[PDB]
C-alpha cells in the first residue's frame, strides 16, 4: 500500500531525516532543492556516492525527501548521504528478501564505513587557563 | 613591471594570429608574452572564445584555461 | 518583622538531636567551652575524640591551630580511626564544623571532622550460600 520508511543520520550536529516512498518516477530532493542544484559540485559528488556505489537501478521507482537541520555546510552533506544509504537498506529489509539486502549492505561497507555508521567525534570542551581545548596561556620568565 | 593598459595596432594582430597556435593559453601566460596587463589580456581572450577561435577547457569564476581549436 | 510575615502565618518548633556525639556542630561548641575556660588543650581534645568514638563513631579528627603557645602560630591535630579524604562520596560519610575562638591574644580556629558510619563506594561483600 503506502510502502513508506523513515531513517536518519548524524555527523556532528546535523540530523538528517529521510522518507523513502514507492512512487512512479525516481525523485531525490534535499531540504526542497533537487539533487542537481546542490553546490559546490564537490559536495554534490559526496551525496551522489550513496547512489553510484550500488547503482541507480536500485532506486528505480523510489522518492526520497531529506530534511536537514543543525550543523554546517559540510556536516549536512555527510548526514544527508547516510540517511539516503540507510534508507535504501531499510526499504529493502521491509519489502524484499535478505539475500538482496545483504548484497547491498556489503557494497556500501566495502567502500566507506560511514555510509551506514555514525561518526562519534564531537567537539571537546574548553577549560579555564586555556585559550582552547588544549592550548595554555603564554609563559614569560623575565 | 611595465605592462600596457590598452592594445595598439601591433599587439592586436599578434593576439589574433599567434595566440590561437598555443597548446596552453591563460590570461597570465599571454600577459608576459605581449607585455599587457592581465585585465586587458583576459578581455582579449574572451573575444577569441566568442568568435570560436580557441576552445574553453576549465571555467570558473576566477580561472579560465583555453587551448587550440584543433 | 524582618521578612514581613503576616500574623498567624509563621510557626517554629524545636526538636531534639538524637545523639550529640555524632554532630560536629555541637561537639565544636563543647570544645570551645573548655577552651574559653582554663583547660589544657591536649586534655580538651582527648575528651572530644574519646567521647565520639565511645558514642559509636567510625573515625574522628580534631584540629587546633593558631598561636597555641608562644608568638609563633602552630597546628596540633589529633586523629583516630579511619577517614576518607578524596572523591565525591566524602561529602556524605563525613561531617565537619569550624569556629573562631577569641583568646586574650590573637585568634584560635578549631575544626572537628567526624566520619558517620548506602555502603562505601569500594566495598564488596559476598553472600554466604545456603
Amino acid at each position: 500500500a503506502l510502502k513508506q520508511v523513515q531513517t536518519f543520520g548524524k555527523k556532528k550536529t546535523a540530523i538528517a531525516v529521510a522518507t523513502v516512498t514507492k512512487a512512479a518516477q525516481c525523485n531525490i530532493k534535499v531540504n526542497g532543492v533537487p539533487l542537481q542544484q546542490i553546490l559546490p559540485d564537490t559536495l554534490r559528488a559526496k551525496i551522489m556516492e550513496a547512489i553510484t556505489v550500488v547503482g541507480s537501478k536500485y532506486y528505480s521507482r523510489l522518492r526520497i525527501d531529506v530534511a536537514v537541520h543543525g550543523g554546517g555546510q559540510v556536516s549536512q552533506a555527510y548526514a544527508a548521504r547516510q540517511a539516503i544509504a540507510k534508507g535504501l537498506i531499510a526499504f529493502f529489509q521491509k519489502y524484499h528478501n535478505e539475500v538482496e539486502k545483504a548484497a547491498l549492505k556489503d557494497k556500501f561497507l566495502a567502500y566507506d564505513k560511514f555510509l551506514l555508521i555514525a561518526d562519534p567525534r564531537r567537539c571537546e570542551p574548553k577549560k579555564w587557563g586555556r585559550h582552547s581545548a588544549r592550548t595554555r596561556f603564554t609563559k614569560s620568565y623575565r | 613591471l611595465q605592462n600596457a593598459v590598452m592594445f595598439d595596432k601591433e599587439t592586436y594582430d599578434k593576439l589574433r594570429s599567434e595566440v590561437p597556435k598555443y597548446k596552453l593559453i591563460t590570461p597570465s601566460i599571454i600577459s608576459d608574452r605581449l607585455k599587457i596587463a592581465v585585465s586587458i589580456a583576459a578581455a582579449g581572450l574572451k573575444q577569441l572564445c566568442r568568435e570560436k577561435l580557441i576552445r574553453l577547457v576549465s571555467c570558473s569564476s576566477k580561472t579560465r584555461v583555453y587551448t587550440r581549436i584543433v | 518583622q524582618r521578612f514581613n510575615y503576616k500574623e498567624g502565618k509563621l510557626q517554629l518548633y524545636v526538636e531534639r538531636v538524637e545523639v550529640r556525639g555524632l554532630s560536629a556542630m555541637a561537639q565544636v561548641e563543647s570544645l570551645r567551652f573548655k577552651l574559653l575556660s582554663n583547660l589544657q588543650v591536649r586534655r580538651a581534645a582527648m575528651g572530644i575524640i574519646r567521647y565520639v568514638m565511645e558514642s559509636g563513631a567510625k573515625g574522628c579528627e580534631v584540629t587546633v591551630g593558631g598561636k597555641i603557645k608562644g608568638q609563633r602560630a602552630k597546628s596540633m591535630t589529633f586523629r583516630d580511626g579511619y577517614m576518607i579524604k578524596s572523591g565525591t562520596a566524602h561529602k556524605s560519610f563525613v561531617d565537619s564544623a569550624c569556629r573562631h575562638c577569641y583568646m586574650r591574644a590573637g585568634c584560635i580556629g578549631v575544626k572537628v571532622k567526624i566520619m558517620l558510619p548506602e555502603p562505601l563506594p569500594d566495598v564488596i561483600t559476598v553472600i554466604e550460600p545456603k
Binding site: 555527523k11 559546490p40 564537490t42 559536495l43 559528488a45 559526496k46 551522489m48 556516492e49 553510484t52 556505489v53 550500488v54 547503482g55 541507480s56 537501478k57 559540510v74 555527510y78 557494497k107 566507506d112 560511514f114 561518526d119 567525534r121 | 597548446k23 596552453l24 591563460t26 597570465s28 601566460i29 600577459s31 608576459d32 592581465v38 577547457v57 576549465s58 570558473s60 580561472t63 584555461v65 587551448t67 | -
Partner: protein
C-alpha cells in the same frame, strides 16, 4: 549498475602503477570521486599509507594561517591543476602525479647520530616528496603574476621528468650529495 569512479568525473584510475618498487606499497591508488573524505587517518601508526594519493596533495595545500582549514578551496585548485597538466604533457594527469612523488625525495640522508650517512625509510620518501613540491609552488607564486594552478602544474610536470628546474629536485640533489660526503 555500478561503475568504477573517476576523479572529477573525468580522469581514470585504471592502470595506475609505480615504476619504483620500493614505494609501491606506500602510494595508494584506490579510486575516488573527490579529494574530500572525513576519515580518522591518524588513529593507527600506518594508516596514512592507505589514504588516496590525490587527497594527500590537497591536504598539503592547507598551510599558513590563510590556508588553514580550507579544504574545499584546495580541491578546486587541484581541479584546474590537472587540466593544465593534461595540456602540458598530453598524458593522464594521475600518472604524472605518482611519477612525481616517486622522484621528489632523497634516497639517502645525513643525520647527527655521529654527521653520518643514513638511508631513508620509504614512508619518509613519500611524505617528503609531497611536502617539497607543495612548498616549492607556494613560494614561487607569492608576489607573482602567475596563479597557483599554473605554478603547481609546472612543479609537478618538471618533477616527474627529473628536471633540475624543480624546487623538489634541487633539494633532493643537494641532500643526496651531502649525505654521500658523510658516508
Amino acid at each position: 549498475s555500478s561503475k568504477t569512479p573517476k576523479l572529477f568525473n573525468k580522469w581514470s584510475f585504471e592502470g595506475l602503477e609505480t615504476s619504483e618498487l620500493a614505494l609501491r606499497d606506500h602510494i595508494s591508488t584506490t579510486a575516488a570521486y573527490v579529494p574530500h573524505t572525513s576519515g580518522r587517518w591518524q588513529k593507527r601508526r600506518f594508516y596514512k599509507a592507505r589514504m588516496p594519493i590525490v587527497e594527500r596533495l590537497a591536504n598539503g595545500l592547507m598551510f599558513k594561517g590563510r590556508g588553514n582549514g580550507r579544504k574545499l578551496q584546495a580541491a578546486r585548485l587541484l581541479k584546474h591543476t590537472l587540466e593544465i597538466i593534461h595540456l602540458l604533457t598530453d598524458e593522464n594527469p594521475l600518472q604524472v602525479v605518482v611519477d612525481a612523488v616517486s622522484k621528489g625525495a632523497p634516497r639517502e640522508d645525513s643525520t647527527r647520530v655521529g654527521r653520518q650517512a643514513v638511508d631513508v625509510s620509504p614512508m619518509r620518501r613519500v611524505n617528503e616528496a609531497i611536502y617539497q613540491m607543495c612548498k616549492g609552488a607556494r613560494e614561487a607564486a607569492f608576489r607573482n603574476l602567475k596563479s597557483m594552478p599554473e605554478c603547481l602544474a609546472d612543479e609537478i610536470v618538471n618533477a616527474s621528468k627529473g628536471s633540475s628546474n624543480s624546487y623538489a629536485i634541487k633539494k633532493k640533489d643537494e641532500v643526496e650529495r651531502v649525505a654521500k660526503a658523510n658516508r
